[PDB]
Design a protein around this nucleic acid. Structure first.
Lengths: 276, 276
DNA sequence: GACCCTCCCCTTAGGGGAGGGTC
DNA sequence: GACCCTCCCCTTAGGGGAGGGTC
């Protein structure tokens, strides 16, 4: 009190690094009361340690340093408001995280569900829960025509809402006794929606709808141009055999298996058609 | 598909900056499929745009870039776990924020409560809600002896638990008909606790207790060595006059009014003594 | 005429030394 | 022998130009 504290003494007493103290000295946020002109040593009075209280508390909640310089000036009423502001920003970060957390969870449900598929190449008839999607007319686009770039607009809408970018790429087409793959063209191309947040301002060439909840004759396999059509053939036959009645387009989903620029690419395809 | 996309084309299609793309190219996170040897132009195939999906989703949740390079390698089962890890970290950040949010709120209740004090210099008898505190023996320390450095240990305990550092500094002393300020010495010095988180490992020279809930004869004023003692005198007299019976030490609280290295320092003092 | 490229400087809040005095 | 000081280099993920070619 009747002498000075060396920077190291303040460091131990305020539980603040010596390097932090020098830095706060440099940005004129908290400078020592006296710097020995010959030795350059920094000296602090006991009375000024109180200024480190407002600086540590603010640093704990994350406010920027230059932001603090404006905080030490303001009076108690103004500081009160300041905290009200911080509260607004924390609730913001909380909401962002809560939602994120849910999105991650949904991504995992679907990730695992496809991960533990009964078997590949086989036609399975299962009871599906609905899957909300955002689609758009597939202007002529066909199985041998689609490009990732074709989903660009769909992906930007889903991206603003979900933050996360779809894992799978969808397409739909009329159920017909297709002879060849060139005989087919997609009605719509779509991407699943995860979040339930409103899309900023969806344009009218996008439709928000769903793959209906219900019963579907499904089949999943690993992608190959030959297999895409051959497996569709199994479905077309499985339905003809059981004499089932289709009540929807054929839904086609293509999920990437790894996202590594190193390995050879491989996707998982999944075709479902709703039956009575 | 049968040609290449220029960096700008990819930029518009994936909603990723050109500068981001070059940077992902530099850190070998996502490099173009072909770079024209003479012009240096970067060229991307439609097929590789899919790698930006895993990169954008991860970037949205905050995972580091070099962290991503390890994510694109791992397979679907491993990626599933990865998300489980992210979920752990998000819940962590949520908890940190929730608590922070509460602490901020409490800081504001007290900040305002003292902010809208009835009047200064007057003795008010009010019904107080308890205030949990952490105290320590005040080894000889007296009104003209205390230093901020005296609260160093107390402050480090409260700091690990509350994150926030106490606003006020407390002291207590036996209630006596004090003749002079030199006649007094503090029994304990204390600092209020906000959070209800357990202190890592409090040492036995610290006591976790409280200023009891109950009725107190209080007085708040602006600090001055003369006023500290003169106002105590009002309290000593107010109790003698009303013939009240004190049932606790005199509690002394000192709150800083501004934390600015510019303005002259000024504190708010507040003395309360519990009566029957 | 738009596009694209390669430097180059800049941003938060310090932590890590290294070389050289000082309480 | 501890302490303290002044450079100096380094860290994330790019955004901003500037000077100079290119689709």
């Amino acid at each position: 009190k009747e002498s000075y504290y060396s920077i190291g003494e303040v460091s131990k007493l305020a539980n603040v690094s010596i390097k932090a103290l020098r830095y706060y000295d440099k940005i004129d946020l908290f400078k020592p009361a006296y710097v020995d002109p010959d030795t350059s040593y920094r000296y602090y009075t006991d009375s000024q340690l109180i200024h480190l209280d407002l600086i540590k508390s603010l640093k704990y909640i994350g406010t920027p340093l230059e932001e603090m310089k404006k905080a030490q000036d303001l009076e108690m009423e103004e500081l009160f408001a300041f905290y009200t502001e911080q509260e607004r920003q924390i609730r913001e970060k909380l909401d962002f995280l809560s939602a994120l957390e849910q999105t991650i969870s949904l991504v995992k449900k679907r990730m695992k569900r496809q991960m533990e598929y009964p078997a590949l190449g086989e036609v399975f008839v299962l009871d599906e829960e609905e899957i909300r999607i955002i689609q758009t007319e597939a202007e002529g686009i066909g199985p041998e025509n689609v490009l990732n770039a074709s989903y660009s607009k769909l992906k930007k809408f889903i991206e603003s809402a979900d933050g996360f970018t779809n894992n799978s790429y969808g397409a739909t087409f009329s159920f017909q006794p297709y002879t060849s793959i060139d005989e087919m063209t997609y009605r719509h191309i779509f991407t699943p929606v995860l979040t339930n947040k409103q899309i900023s301002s969806i344009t009218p060439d996008m439709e928000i709808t769903t793959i209906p909840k219900g019963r579907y004759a499904c089949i999943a396999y690993n992608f190959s141009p030959e297999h895409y059509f051959l497996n569709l053939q199994k479905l077309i036959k499985y339905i003809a055999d059981r004499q089932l009645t289709v009540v929807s387009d054929v839904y086609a989903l293509i999920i990437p298996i790894h996202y590594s620029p190193k390995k050879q690419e491989e996707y998982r395809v999944e075709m479902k058609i709703r039956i009575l």
